[PDB]
Amino acid sequence: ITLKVAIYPYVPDPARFQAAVLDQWQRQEPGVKLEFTDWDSYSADPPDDLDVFVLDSIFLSHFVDAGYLLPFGSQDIDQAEDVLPFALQGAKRNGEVYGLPQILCTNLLFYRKGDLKIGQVDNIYELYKKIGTSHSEQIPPPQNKGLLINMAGGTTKASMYLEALIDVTGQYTEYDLLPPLDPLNDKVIRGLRLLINMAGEKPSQYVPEDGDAYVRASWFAQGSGRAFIGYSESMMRMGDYAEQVRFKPISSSAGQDIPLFYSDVVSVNSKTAHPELAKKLANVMASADTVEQALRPQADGQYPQYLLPARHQVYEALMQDYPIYSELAQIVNKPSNRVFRLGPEVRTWLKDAKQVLPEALG
């Protein structure tokens, strides 16, 4: 018996998850063979032969309504009390749980240790008042000046627009019905362009030849820029400098902020020939031991991935050795947190949004 699996690829070190998963699986099911495949939810719907797979929750609605998935009964979830309440609910549709939260992700504001003026900012506007408009188009920005943020790619802009829209309207929604691409919300465009202003056109749109998704974390560490807005996992790239920066959540509006998190959930194909085994493997891929082993450094010279896990246990275990996770736990344990979800028509809407957003911005 062979189960085809696919892990989430957009992580600092994919091989570490795979190594962790296979290792733990052998302990419980040595008779079952795992075959890892390349699959990106961002580009394709689940192929008919892929039994278990991790996907970004923005496609969950579509996957569910298309009949691609198999739900998890309360009897099929191991230690459900350990999962962060909001992450588990963000995985529900039609009153059923359709995925086990494995990784969480959000944008943070990274600033340097002594730099207090920046550490008191709460939203992008107050942030503008401190760093102002970026004067140069050079890559990277001059030492200690400008804002570092990755706004390259049509999907990133489209996602930021939607996340911003929730913060503006002060109302959280799973976007079952996606907003019109015409006319666009100005308060949102006004804010996205303000980010591009503090960062500069060239720098914000720059894509590295090597495809290093975390290069800006390298620049920030070297001394480039005044502030950096990126994912927590960017801290792995900072290496030893990770201990030299502070971070905090930043609101896209000026009033009541709704903290949004991307959630990567493990799901089971409705076409699987081994539903109970696949449901077991999904639990393994989302268990505290697996995720803990994948976030921790394996060989010497490796740093923690600094990804946000979805279980309390993982945070409690990691924070002994890595104090950073103690600060990350406070961030994820806030009351108002919600998972970023999008409607079933997310694919066509995205496709259309890319043709209008760059224009609306410049």
Side-chain angles (χ1 to χ4, degrees):
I1 302 176
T2 307
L3 288 184
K4 296 193 181 175
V5 203
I7 57 179
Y8 190 68
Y10 301 112
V11 297
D13 181 10
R16 242 187 293 178
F17 275 84
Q18 176 174 343
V21 162
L22 192 57
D23 179 59
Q24 291 289 145
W25 183 243
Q26 280 181 112
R27 302 180 199 204
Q28 303 186 209
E29 298 282 344
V32 185
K33 205 260 186 179
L34 295 186
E35 192 173 293
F36 295 89
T37 326
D38 281 319
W39 177 74
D40 186 10
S41 73
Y42 272 93
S43 63
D45 282 349
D48 294 327
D49 57 350
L50 193 65
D51 309 279
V52 184
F53 47 82
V54 193
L55 58 124
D56 189 297
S57 280
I58 64 171
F59 305 104
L60 190 58
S61 287
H62 173 233
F63 286 6
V64 170
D65 299 347
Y68 291 140
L69 309 182
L70 214 65
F72 291 80
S74 184
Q75 195 73 173
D76 305 318
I77 308 174
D78 293 331
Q79 297 183 61
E81 75 279 350
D82 187 34
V83 181
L84 301 179
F86 85 95
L88 189 53
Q89 295 183 339
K92 288 177 186 177
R93 187 158 188 63
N94 306 331
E96 311 184 84
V97 176
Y98 277 96
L100 307 191
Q102 183 192 229
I103 302 167
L104 295 174
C105 179
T106 187
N107 270 328
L108 290 174
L109 177 76
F110 290 100
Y111 65 96
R112 299 188 181 94
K113 204 180 188 297
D115 194 1
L116 304 176
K117 284 177 51 192
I118 296 296
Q120 54 189 38
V121 173
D122 280 311
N123 58 95
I124 71 169
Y125 303 101
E126 299 184 353
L127 194 258
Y128 186 62
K129 295 184 178 184
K130 296 300 175 303
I131 62 180
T133 300
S134 172
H135 304 304
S136 53
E137 289 299 294
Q138 59 182 280
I139 305 179
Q143 172 181 228
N144 202 42
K145 276 167 56 176
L147 165 68
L148 295 179
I149 186 162
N150 177 16
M151 296 190 62
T155 303
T156 299
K157 301 186 193 64
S159 289
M160 289 175 75
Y161 179 87
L162 291 171
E163 281 189 290
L165 193 54
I166 288 183
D167 283 326
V168 172
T169 65
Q171 207 64 212
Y172 174 81
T173 167
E174 296 191 345
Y175 285 108
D176 287 313
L177 59 316
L178 293 162
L181 289 174
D182 185 17
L184 292 176
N185 188 298
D186 307 328
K187 311 180 66 178
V188 178
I189 296 303
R190 194 181 305 157
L192 287 185
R193 188 185 292 139
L194 196 72
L195 282 176
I196 298 183
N197 282 350
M198 301 183 274
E201 302 184 319
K202 277 194 187 301
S204 71
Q205 302 304 298
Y206 180 75
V207 174
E209 189 191 323
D210 51 16
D212 187 349
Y214 310 100
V215 75
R216 293 179 180 67
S218 163
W219 296 347
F220 189 60
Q222 295 292 313
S224 178
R226 185 68 189 289
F228 171 47
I229 292 179
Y231 308 128
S232 64
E233 61 258 38
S234 290
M235 280 186 276
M236 186 191 81
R237 187 46 177 289
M238 298 180 160
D240 289 336
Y241 196 77
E243 296 154 25
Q244 314 276 228
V245 305
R246 298 293 164 283
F247 45 85
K248 63 180 292 174
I250 292 308
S251 176
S252 308
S253 183
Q256 290 189 79
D257 181 61
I258 308 179
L260 289 182
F261 293 70
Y262 291 85
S263 178
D264 306 301
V265 298
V266 194
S267 304
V268 188
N269 205 332
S270 68
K271 293 191 184 54
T272 188
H274 303 277
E276 288 305 319
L277 212 37
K279 280 178 168 172
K280 187 170 194 171
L281 169 60
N283 261 291
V284 173
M285 287 176 75
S287 68
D289 290 337
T290 293
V291 171
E292 193 197 343
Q293 191 180 314
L295 304 192
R296 275 187 179 272
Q298 289 311 280
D300 301 346
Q302 275 190 359
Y303 296 87
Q305 304 214 49
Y306 288 110
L307 288 158
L308 300 175
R311 294 185 165 274
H312 283 112
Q313 271 179 26
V314 189
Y315 283 101
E316 293 177 83
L318 289 171
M319 69 164 71
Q320 301 180 340
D321 307 343
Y322 306 105
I324 291 187
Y325 272 102
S326 174
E327 287 286 277
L328 294 179
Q330 272 182 35
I331 289 184
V332 84
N333 279 124
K334 307 292 188 63
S336 44
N337 304 151
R338 298 301 214 116
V339 174
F340 187 38
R341 289 264 255 123
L342 293 193
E345 292 160 83
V346 58
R347 292 205 192 287
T348 89
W349 190 96
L350 247 34
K351 170 187 162 184
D352 295 348
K354 297 182 178 187
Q355 312 155 187
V356 59
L357 250 45
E359 276 82 323
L361 296 174

